[PDB]
Design a protein around this ligand. Sequence first.
Ligand SMILES: [Mg+2]
Ligand SMILES: [Mg+2]
Ligand SMILES: [Mg+2]
Ligand SMILES: [Mg+2]
Ligand SMILES: [Mg+2]
Ligand SMILES: [Mg+2]
Ligand SMILES: [Mg+2]
Ligand SMILES: [Mg+2]
Ligand SMILES: [Mg+2]
Ligand SMILES: [Mg+2]
Ligand SMILES: [Mg+2]
Ligand SMILES: [Mg+2]
Ligand SMILES: [Mg+2]
Ligand SMILES: [Mg+2]
Ligand SMILES: [Mg+2]
Ligand SMILES: [Mg+2]
Ligand SMILES: [Mg+2]
Ligand SMILES: [Mg+2]
Ligand SMILES: [Mg+2]
Ligand SMILES: [Mg+2]
Ligand SMILES: [Mg+2]
Ligand SMILES: [Mg+2]
Ligand SMILES: [Mg+2]
Ligand SMILES: [Mg+2]
Ligand SMILES: [Mg+2]
Ligand SMILES: [Mg+2]
Ligand SMILES: [Mg+2]
Ligand SMILES: [Mg+2]
Ligand SMILES: [Mg+2]
Ligand SMILES: [Mg+2]
Ligand SMILES: [Mg+2]
Ligand SMILES: [Mg+2]
Ligand SMILES: [Mg+2]
Ligand SMILES: [Mg+2]
Ligand SMILES: [Mg+2]
Ligand SMILES: [Mg+2]
Ligand SMILES: [Mg+2]
Ligand SMILES: [Mg+2]
Ligand SMILES: [Mg+2]
Ligand SMILES: [Mg+2]
Ligand SMILES: [Mg+2]
Ligand SMILES: [Mg+2]
Ligand SMILES: [Mg+2]
Ligand SMILES: [Mg+2]
Ligand SMILES: [Mg+2]
Ligand SMILES: [Mg+2]
Ligand SMILES: [Mg+2]
Ligand SMILES: [Mg+2]
Ligand SMILES: [Mg+2]
Ligand SMILES: [Mg+2]
Ligand SMILES: [Mg+2]
Ligand SMILES: [Mg+2]
Ligand SMILES: [Mg+2]
Ligand SMILES: [Mg+2]
Ligand SMILES: [Mg+2]
Ligand SMILES: [Mg+2]
Ligand SMILES: [Mg+2]
Ligand SMILES: [Mg+2]
Ligand SMILES: [Mg+2]
Ligand SMILES: [Mg+2]
Ligand SMILES: [Mg+2]
Ligand SMILES: [Mg+2]
Ligand SMILES: [Mg+2]
Ligand SMILES: [Mg+2]
Ligand SMILES: [Mg+2]
Ligand SMILES: [Mg+2]
Ligand SMILES: [Mg+2]
Ligand SMILES: [Mg+2]
Lengths: 88, 119, 272
Amino acid sequence: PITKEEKQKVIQEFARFPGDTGSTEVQVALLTLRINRLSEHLKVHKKDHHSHRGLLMMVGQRRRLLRYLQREDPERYRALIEKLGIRG
Amino acid sequence: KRQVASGRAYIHASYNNTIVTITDPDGNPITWSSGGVIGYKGSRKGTPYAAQLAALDAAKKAMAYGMQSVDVIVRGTGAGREQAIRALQASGLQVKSIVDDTPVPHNGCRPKKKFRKAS
Amino acid sequence: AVKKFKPYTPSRRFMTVADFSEITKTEPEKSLVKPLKKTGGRNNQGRITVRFRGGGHKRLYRIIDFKRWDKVGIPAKVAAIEYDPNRSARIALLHYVDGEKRYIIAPDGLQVGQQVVAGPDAPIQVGNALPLRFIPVGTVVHAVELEPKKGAKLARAAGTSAQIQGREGDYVILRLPSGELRKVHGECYATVGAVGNADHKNIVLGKAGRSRWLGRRPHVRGAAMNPVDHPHGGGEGRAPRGRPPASPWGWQTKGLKTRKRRKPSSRFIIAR
RNA sequence: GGCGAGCUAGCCCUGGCCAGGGUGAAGCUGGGGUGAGACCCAGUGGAGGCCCGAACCGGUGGGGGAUGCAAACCCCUCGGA
RNA sequence: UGAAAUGCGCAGAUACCGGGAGGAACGCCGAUGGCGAAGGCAGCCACCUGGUCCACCCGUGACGCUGAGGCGCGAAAGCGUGGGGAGCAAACCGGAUUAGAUACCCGGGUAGUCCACGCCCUAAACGAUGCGCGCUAGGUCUCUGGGUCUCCUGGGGGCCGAAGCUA
RNA sequence: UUUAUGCUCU
Ligand SMILES: [Mg+2]
Ligand SMILES: [Mg+2]
Ligand SMILES: [Mg+2]
Ligand SMILES: [Mg+2]
Ligand SMILES: [Mg+2]
Ligand SMILES: [Mg+2]
Ligand SMILES: [Mg+2]
Ligand SMILES: [Mg+2]
Ligand SMILES: [Mg+2]
Ligand SMILES: [Mg+2]
Ligand SMILES: [Mg+2]
Ligand SMILES: [Mg+2]
Ligand SMILES: [Mg+2]
Ligand SMILES: [Mg+2]
Ligand SMILES: [Mg+2]
Ligand SMILES: [Mg+2]
Ligand SMILES: [Mg+2]
Ligand SMILES: [Mg+2]
Ligand SMILES: [Mg+2]
Ligand SMILES: [Mg+2]
Ligand SMILES: [Mg+2]
Ligand SMILES: [Mg+2]
Ligand SMILES: [Mg+2]
Ligand SMILES: [Mg+2]
Ligand SMILES: [Mg+2]
Ligand SMILES: [Mg+2]
Ligand SMILES: [Mg+2]
Ligand SMILES: [Mg+2]
Ligand SMILES: [Mg+2]
Ligand SMILES: [Mg+2]
Ligand SMILES: [Mg+2]
Ligand SMILES: [Mg+2]
Ligand SMILES: [Mg+2]
Ligand SMILES: [Mg+2]
Ligand SMILES: [Mg+2]
Ligand SMILES: [Mg+2]
Ligand SMILES: [Mg+2]
Ligand SMILES: [Mg+2]
Ligand SMILES: [Mg+2]
Ligand SMILES: [Mg+2]
Ligand SMILES: [Mg+2]
Ligand SMILES: [Mg+2]
Ligand SMILES: [Mg+2]
Ligand SMILES: [Mg+2]
Ligand SMILES: [Mg+2]
Ligand SMILES: [Mg+2]
Ligand SMILES: [Mg+2]
Ligand SMILES: [Mg+2]
Ligand SMILES: [Mg+2]
Ligand SMILES: [Mg+2]
Ligand SMILES: [Mg+2]
Ligand SMILES: [Mg+2]
Ligand SMILES: [Mg+2]
Ligand SMILES: [Mg+2]
Ligand SMILES: [Mg+2]
Ligand SMILES: [Mg+2]
Ligand SMILES: [Mg+2]
Ligand SMILES: [Mg+2]
Ligand SMILES: [Mg+2]
Ligand SMILES: [Mg+2]
Ligand SMILES: [Mg+2]
Ligand SMILES: [Mg+2]
Ligand SMILES: [Mg+2]
Ligand SMILES: [Mg+2]
Ligand SMILES: [Mg+2]
Ligand SMILES: [Mg+2]
Ligand SMILES: [Mg+2]
Ligand SMILES: [Mg+2]
């Protein structure tokens, strides 16, 4: 699983400012972490559909945010994506 | 092929019949009987009276080879159980104990349509 | 897996080929430990004694190592997995620390670059050979000896294996690929694991020629012959067998058992 | 009891041969596509008891030949290539 | 079995003991309980992983709701390729019953039931009740969190019920 | 453990 400092590492690295524990990007980035994890889990355990369900949910959520962010700030949209490697 | 005092008695009690085999201390049957050996056919054998008659013909043949004590063991429901257990005691053979070892699966093989009914 | 083809010709439509991704830098084989020239001949001294053979691709014989006690204790690295035309299984070239090279029938799982060893010692993992007596009851195994020191004979076909079922004296009880339960001497070497290339059974020759490549000439039915030739020859417009189905030489071929009755071997068997 | 596979059949060892054109499989690359895929589109590529057709191997139909050129031929036509 | 008959058995059966093989399902716990969006999920262990709730009031600052198409999942049966096959059991055979009995009862029994992979996309797939949000008495039983642990508070699962709704 | 069935319109 994603360990505490393991996710902390990410929280800090994307935080819009020392103290930011749930901005748009910190969330997007956070999701991205779990998604890529599961995505690699499902590649192995493919007949595990229930878990894949959540994946869709995590994926769908991530999209909603990014659409908001690219609506309010089309700059740190490119920035966030580029830094995460998303939208293919 | 031998005469042993201490022994062991087995009661197989099914809906259709009751059969009793009496073994040595080791389990090797010394002699046996059932509802049919008594003289009954059909469903008369599933009777508790047929069980009684049976368990006596068992014990009687056992005492022949010199049978004194047994450790009665019953397997299966049915009208044979008690009357067969009782009968034994009420003739020679002192019943040193009465164990119930009727086999039951922890949900093993699927049973026949007849014994499934519910789900 | 198994390779398939879009039907750009008939036959290519059903034709299916083996997957050769498992094959490590083969192509040129290992001229030393094998090959030898293989005397391709379809009859004995003079006459045909097995019908319908001949033709088919030329072959170099890879002289494989079917007795591993030959080098007890001496470990070795698996250098490559190779194609061997003389068997259904694949072969594994292995370099011994000795500097001695030998081929082995490649077991399922056996990865390139791993260590292998044989002897009463010998960790119970894939590729290692041991006298049967020292193998944990229940493990699957291949390339077994039938009598000690006489070389492997059993379970060598692609995908085959044998299970150690129990022990009894200086003998252990195997369940042979045929399903037969047999006692084999404990001293007989075996090697842990199934044979591999188990998809083998699933290829489809696809065409007549494909059978020609493998050296199998057309097989003709007694039904298509004349009485001179076969129990089933003659008639006058198709015909049932008109007698118990027979071989060209007269013996029945549907059920009639053929194993010699009073045979020393009989005392060590127990199945199908 | 011998003589025969210098014809013919099969097989074994070692060599040789198959003009030219057509169709364009996989794979590869790039692009689109997706959470990642399947997959789709191009281009590349050059597979096949694949196509047309000489050599070569055949012998389908017809005509001719019938004390023949010939104890199995010739012409036209046709099959594989 | 209603009673029987077919069936098995003096070629040594049933009953009993010891050894071995093999497959499937997991008794008590177990609940009128729990989890999941649904289908559905029940011995034990470990790894990988989804959803969900509570406390704190810490961060983003409407970033929400629904959702024609699309995509995914989807009991049982069924299908393809392999394997596996103990018990059970469509079909099928036999014994009974009956006017007949292609059924009901009995003895046999093959696909299938099991695993891998790939299809099929159905259902009384039922709470016959689409999803989200606010508003409108309470009583009691229960599962599971937090609590200044008689009581309060949050999320679930049941019954009885104010107001109202309903043929 | 043996039963099935009851013509047409009022
Ligand atoms: Mg009876
Ligand atoms: Mg027992
Ligand atoms: Mg000879
Ligand atoms: Mg010779
Ligand atoms: Mg000779
Ligand atoms: Mg085959
Ligand atoms: Mg043939
Ligand atoms: Mg003929
Ligand atoms: Mg001849
Ligand atoms: Mg003949
Ligand atoms: Mg004939
Ligand atoms: Mg005819
Ligand atoms: Mg001669
Ligand atoms: Mg010749
Ligand atoms: Mg030339
Ligand atoms: Mg060309
Ligand atoms: Mg590509
Ligand atoms: Mg791309
Ligand atoms: Mg080109
Ligand atoms: Mg292409
Ligand atoms: Mg061609
Ligand atoms: Mg053609
Ligand atoms: Mg043509
Ligand atoms: Mg041509
Ligand atoms: Mg032409
Ligand atoms: Mg001609
Ligand atoms: Mg002709
Ligand atoms: Mg002609
Ligand atoms: Mg002519
Ligand atoms: Mg003519
Ligand atoms: Mg003429
Ligand atoms: Mg031509
Ligand atoms: Mg008899
Ligand atoms: Mg009989
Ligand atoms: Mg006898
Ligand atoms: Mg037993
Ligand atoms: Mg629930
Ligand atoms: Mg349900
Ligand atoms: Mg969890
Ligand atoms: Mg706040
Ligand atoms: Mg603010
Ligand atoms: Mg439309
Ligand atoms: Mg699908
Ligand atoms: Mg389904
Ligand atoms: Mg199913
Ligand atoms: Mg199937
Ligand atoms: Mg099958
Ligand atoms: Mg019947
Ligand atoms: Mg009948
Ligand atoms: Mg009659
Ligand atoms: Mg009836
Ligand atoms: Mg039945
Ligand atoms: Mg049955
Ligand atoms: Mg069918
Ligand atoms: Mg639908
Ligand atoms: Mg349901
Ligand atoms: Mg309705
Ligand atoms: Mg609702
Ligand atoms: Mg809806
Ligand atoms: Mg809770
Ligand atoms: Mg509490
Ligand atoms: Mg409540
Ligand atoms: Mg109510
Ligand atoms: Mg009211
Ligand atoms: Mg009538
Ligand atoms: Mg009436
Ligand atoms: Mg009438
Ligand atoms: Mg009228």
